[PDB]
Design a protein around this ligand. Structure first.
Ligand SMILES: CC[C@H](C)C(=O)C(=O)O
Ligand SMILES: [Mg+2]
Length: 364
């Protein structure tokens, strides 16, 4: 007998360029927590249902997890674009959802059953602009690009644009693209003709990486910031050596000295031979929230004796009150499910000259 927790992430489609890291983090959490006895001796069982890359797939995944798999709660989905469409299904059904990577404005406000462990664009993104200005105090002109079909990208670009304004910089253009585009020659050239000193990109991984590469090919030599959708080594394959120097804000640091991070990092590094990415740590934290909440609930109200609808409602109520020492640091929730998290960072892509290997270097 086990306690089923649903994992609804993009395991297929180009969105899996981000989802792959989350699956890895979730599996690490499953072993970590089950090795400690699961929920007071009862193991958890992660049940994975692929959302693919769109809203319909996420709705189907959620409905399958809720109705067929009988899960006590869901971790997911990968994208805010998917969450805005699918989370209301879980809200209506009174099934908790914890978002591992949904950073758009308005996610926790979807309802009383929606929380997130992923710090939002408003708190994460401005730091990368400040980092760019530290490395080059003479930045004056900024070109901004965003994916106009993606909810997160639209939310993120608004924060980047406001930050540019607040730092006293000139916004020379805002260019739009679609996440499904591969060619950005017209937008890139339009921007390059305005002689920007800094370029900011809000997109996802494949699109973001292709845009970075094309900007460099077209002769752009200035600074580049990528938003959260570019925050994966899976962009290295796409831009290769031309990824070098891209700044991306982080809501996680491998070097964070919390005991559970040391354990998580060690487990990740031993397996994957590189530092754990943000998305992996955030997915781990989402699973942790469920395990620790299930433990606290079970101690007060033995879960094996609670029928599923009440179990879900009590689990939701419990998780919102909890304090968690996670790889992300000490986190908690506001009464509407917003994450409370103190520390943020900025990392910079460092490519080896041959372009076949790279890493994220954290700025001090
Ligand atoms: C995977 C992270 C994703 C791009 C995000 O931040 C969001 O959709 O809100
Ligand atoms: Mg909420």
């Amino acid at each position: 007998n086990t306690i089923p927790i649903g994992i609804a992430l993009a395991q297929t489609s180009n969105v899996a360029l981000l989802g792959q890291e989350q699956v890895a983090g979730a599996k690490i959490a499953e072993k970590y927590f089950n090795d400690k006895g699961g929920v007071n001796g009862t193991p958890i069982k992660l049940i994975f249902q692929d959302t693919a890359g769109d809203e319909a797939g996420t709705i189907n995944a959620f409905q399958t997890l809720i109705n067929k798999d009988k899960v006590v709660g869901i971790v997911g989905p990968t994208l805010s674009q998917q969450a805005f469409s699918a989370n209301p299904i879980a809200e209506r059904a009174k099934v908790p959802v914890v978002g591992p990577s949904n950073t758009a404005k308005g996610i926790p406000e979807i309802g009383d059953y929606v929380a997130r462990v992923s710090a939002p664009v408003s708190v994460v993104a401005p730091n990368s602009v400040k980092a760019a200005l530290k490395q080059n105090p003479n930045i004056k002109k900024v070109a901004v690009f965003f994916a106009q079909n993606d909810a997160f990208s639209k939310s993120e670009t608004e924060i980047f644009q406001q930050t540019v304004k607040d730092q006293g910089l000139e916004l020379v253009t805002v260019q739009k693209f679609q996440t499904t585009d591969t060619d950005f020659q017209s937008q890139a050239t339009n921007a390059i003709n305005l002689k920007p000193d800094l370029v900011i990109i809000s997109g996802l991984a494949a699109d973001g990486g292709n845009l970075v590469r094309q900007l460099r090919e077209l002769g752009y030599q200035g600074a580049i910031i990528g938003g959260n959708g570019l925050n994966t080594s899976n962009v290295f394959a796409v831009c290769k050596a031309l990824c070098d120097g891209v700044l991306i804000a982080q809501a996680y640091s491998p070097e964070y000295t919390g005991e559970i991070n040391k354990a998580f990092r060690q487990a990740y590094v031993d397996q994957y031979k590189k530092e754990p990415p943000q998305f992996s740590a955030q997915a781990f934290a989402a699973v942790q929230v469920y395990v620790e909440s299930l433990k606290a609930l079970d101690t007060k109200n033995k879960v094996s004796k609670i029928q599923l609808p009440e179990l879900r409602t009590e689990l939701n109520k419990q998780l919102l009150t909890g304090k968690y020492n996670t790889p992300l640091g000490e986190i908690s929730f506001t009464p509407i499910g917003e994450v409370v998290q103190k520390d943020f960072y900025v990392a910079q892509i460092k490519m080896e000259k041959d372009g076949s290997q790279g890493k994220f270097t954290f700025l001090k």
